[PDB]
Design a protein around this ligand. Structure first.
Ligand SMILES: O=C(O)CCP(=O)(CCC(=O)O)CCC(=O)O
Ligand SMILES: O=C(O)CCP(=O)(CCC(=O)O)CCC(=O)O
Ligand SMILES: O=C(O)CCP(=O)(CCC(=O)O)CCC(=O)O
Ligand SMILES: O=C(O)CCP(=O)(CCC(=O)O)CCC(=O)O
Ligand SMILES: [Ba+2]
Ligand SMILES: [Cl-]
Ligand SMILES: [Cl-]
Ligand SMILES: [Cl-]
Ligand SMILES: [Cl-]
Ligand SMILES: [K+]
Ligand SMILES: [K+]
Ligand SMILES: [K+]
Ligand SMILES: [K+]
Ligand SMILES: [K+]
Ligand SMILES: [K+]
Ligand SMILES: [K+]
Ligand SMILES: [K+]
Ligand SMILES: [K+]
Ligand SMILES: [K+]
Ligand SMILES: [K+]
Ligand SMILES: [K+]
Ligand SMILES: [K+]
Ligand SMILES: [K+]
Ligand SMILES: [K+]
Lengths: 283, 283, 283, 283
């Protein structure tokens, strides 16, 4: 049973212990729920203004006396600023409510637009993670690797990547705990991430997985979390993506197949058809 | 008497020495004050336009001659763009004012929406701090610790934490002063803060509190300030939270109770009911 | 054939393998396409509301019975909240649709404004790159250099620069690959970039181009990518710019001509007429 | 003649060499110019729509035939969506223009609001710089110092400061140039800047001003630039401030007067009346 899922979310059960987090919740409910809440508030406030006009008397021209329906639709036409001109206010009180309601309609528009824009400007990174990792020799050292691909044509600026080991350990005091290790990489920063990036942790005598095997990684229930971040040109915003691997998803001795190549007519090409392809020696 | 309160604010009295900081003040006044200011400006500018129309003569059809009331509500219906159609402008001057007022109504909407959105997009971190710190042995060293919990389901990216000692000191010149020490941590950066994070300062021979006791920390009026920051997924914005501890809130020999556990049916769980629980040996 | 073009884009052919990336695409299509899409949606939704009213019967006063045209323009006048007052709704159903349509008109405005603002707030850096690099002796070492100029009067805060070597290499395992080297600079950070900045990589015995010649750089198909980033005062936003050089664009022995000078009357001046000027000794 | 002014701007004369930078210029022109440009565009586009209606014939009810004035104000009432109801469109062509104009009015509102909000959300840091620097002994070393004060009640998160020496130098090749040195500080980062911060560069044997005097600093025309940056709580935005000092503004042997004190009744206080006060020994 894996703790981190492939998408980087955790299976940990949160035991725990309406408006406690309202701004957050307005941004994170589904769009159908969000639009329902806006609509609900919009209908509720029109009904309240409708009652306000009735409480003043018959102050709506061409409205049936005592009709909530006519007062409601006049409220709509006032708050939305349609102002057809058949239902119009009569007297100081009605005209004062109109002045207040028009302000409420404008303020409600500002609020709704603010929330919509805050929901919109949360772009995704558009990054693809290799389905597996590998451990194989590179530049004289066994090296843990995975790789990333850009699925968009715009580039990502000052891109950072982390390979994070999560495992259970024992302190010299005998205390058992899970902790994370942000592994040392050959490249942790790419000034411009463009097409594809192979992320590499050389396993030298300082690596937390130095001397480890498939068996000893499972014994410590080791998992690997990958975080990618950068400033995406398409949005002028920071983006981030995550992924996680289990011990079952490390190919010991594996070598990623090159995705960069030179076509027969000479021009260099990227072939993401090979992105998840890994070569192994079969004995 | 503590200088820093538990929430990270200071009790220092600012001795010191209307529109001096207007943008800042518009964003930091309470919402009732903010809405009152918008409403006030909205009513003031309609009155000024009302006087403008009267200064042109009887240029509002169906308006009583010389009536400020009728000119005021016509101004409202024009600036808010309701345009019921009973009060309408007559002649070039009135129609020019309408053209200007409609622009003012649209610009005022843009301004109000800009301020509302700037007030909205200041999210809180949703982080909980342990009510105490502890000092106890971990990995062979006495270690100062506190911990954090995420109260939301979304994660925080590239999370940073600081444990800051603030105390009074004496230079070799004999000058007395208070300064801060950003303490060295075992982990200062969590690429993905998800559920709970124990922040640890090992007290080695380079620590500014090496050899210190409860007595000597009080003698220097030592306090501890914690800053958490990170990029919150729910908002695509950086968030931050702070907390402070006094010497009374350090449990020497204390050990935090585990909040992570494995339920009987095997699945891993987080129990924040234990978040503030600390174990001590009683002699 | 260069891989990186002068503007920092790559000539690599992306082999590969409607609403799959809709938010991104709405922000990156050309403005004519964007406005066409907004207009299209705006006309489509008015037609749908027009059919809605007709499906209710003859519920639009002064509208010809069964006329899609009259129902369409009444829908426009309702969604845009013009409300001339000739075409008005009749009965509960029509007035309910008006209430829904006004909400749709306001929500569509919020959506369009959110997208327009997200497209707008992606400012350019306003930085000029020297058309060439040079390698010449400075402070006792052969040093690779290029330079930047600010084309605006506002300054750029916490400016970072990278000189990135990209070349083909061979590992001791015999694997061939292209990788990047973020070269060590004398100054990688300028707290305030104001007018012009000469970026320098001293070629010491640790430099990846130590001992290299024009010939050996071409043999490894070496290219140089420059990234500039910083917080632009004019926008209160991070900006970035990029540029790339080939081996043909390095002047060995070249010295940039000073762009800073003191005018005859004593005041210091910047002369960007000399920005691309390089001096060479001719033997 | 100083190059950097006290406010951090430079006196360097930019020799050099309508819509070349339009987005930048819309955000940086004065507010009167900005509002004039919006108004101008608003009047120009209404005139063009007015001509459009006239080109269709007498398609505006209650409008005088051939009157540009009546067509202009009908355009205003349509683009602003006032729709009084006296001037109304007649026929397919006029009603099509209305549909287009309403869209233009909504798009123009989105554009204006986007620009206004981009102009608004550029907050100032609210930081005060000491009018002078000092050089005096601290913790066994001559130390260059200045200090900062927060003029607001909200705090600044992850605050960074730079003390930057700018001076003219000579390389071993004999080349003369001005360069900057970002000086090593005792504290360059304050996790929470709250009230006042004394910034200190210890002048040890590695300092670029080690062994320097008032005379030798003037000979190299040395100036000192200070940059402050941080995440301001009031805005949830990064802010920055700058200041510069000349050799005339360094008090050799000076000691800043404490701004923190304990009032007679015991509570700690900040007295910014002393912020610019410096003590000197008079011989
Ligand atoms: O790390 C990798 O796997 C690729 C490094 P590059 O510099 C190789 C480019 C080529 O072979 O043509 C690509 C870096 C990037 O696209 O971001
Ligand atoms: O530092 C801690 O107290 C927890 C470290 P983790 O890696 C432990 C996870 C587990 O025991 O299942 C949790 C890190 C996080 O949630 O951000
Ligand atoms: O690196 C350069 O080429 C210029 C360094 P500066 O400090 C020279 C200023 C002068 O000669 O007057 C300019 C730095 C900047 O404008 O950002
Ligand atoms: O650097 C300074 O001059 C002040 C350091 P502090 O920690 C002194 C606080 C006191 O004396 O009460 C203040 C730091 C801050 O306000 O940001
Ligand atoms: Ba309207
Ligand atoms: Cl740890
Ligand atoms: Cl200090
Ligand atoms: Cl690499
Ligand atoms: Cl330099
Ligand atoms: K409206
Ligand atoms: K209207
Ligand atoms: K009307
Ligand atoms: K409105
Ligand atoms: K924003
Ligand atoms: K309006
Ligand atoms: K409006
Ligand atoms: K932003
Ligand atoms: K509208
Ligand atoms: K109307
Ligand atoms: K009418
Ligand atoms: K509207
Ligand atoms: K708006
Ligand atoms: K409008
Ligand atoms: K509008």
């Amino acid at each position: 049973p894996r703790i981190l899922n492939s998408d980087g979310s955790s299976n940990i059960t949160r035991l725990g212990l309406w408006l406690d987090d309202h701004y957050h919740d307005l941004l994170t409910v589904s769009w159908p729920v969000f639009i329902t809440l806006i609509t609900g508030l919009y209908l509720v406030t029109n009904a309240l203004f409708a009652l306000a006009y009735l409480a003043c008397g018959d102050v709506i021209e061409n409205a049936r006396p005592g009709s909530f329906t006519d007062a409601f639709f006049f409220s709509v036409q006032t708050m939305a600023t349609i102002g057809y001109g058949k239902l119009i206010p009569i007297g100081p009180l009605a005209n004062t409510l109109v002045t207040l309601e028009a302000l409420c309609g404008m303020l409600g528009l500002a609020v709704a637009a603010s929330l919509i824009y805050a929901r919109f400007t949360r772009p995704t990174a558009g990054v693809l993670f290799s389905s597996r990792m590998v451990i194989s020799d590179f530049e004289g050292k066994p090296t843990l690797m995975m790789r990333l691909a850009n699925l968009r044509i715009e580039q990502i600026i000052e891109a950072d990547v982390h390979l994070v080991l999560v495992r259970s350990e024992i302190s010299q005091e005998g205390m058992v705990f899970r902790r994370f290790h942000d592994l040392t990489l050959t490249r942790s920063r790419s000034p411009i991430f463009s097409l594809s990036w192979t992320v590499m942790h050389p396993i030298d005598h300082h690596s937390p997985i130095y001397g480890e095997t498939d068996e000893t990684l499972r014994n410590s229930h080791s998992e690997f979390l990958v975080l990618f971040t950068g400033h995406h040109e398409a949005f002028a915003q920071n983006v981030h993506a995550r992924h996680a691997y289990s011990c079952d998803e490390i190919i010991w001795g594996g070598h990623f197949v090159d995705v960069f190549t030179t076509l027969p007519d000479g021009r260099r090409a990227l072939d993401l058809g090979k992105f998840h392809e890994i070569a192994q020696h079969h004995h």
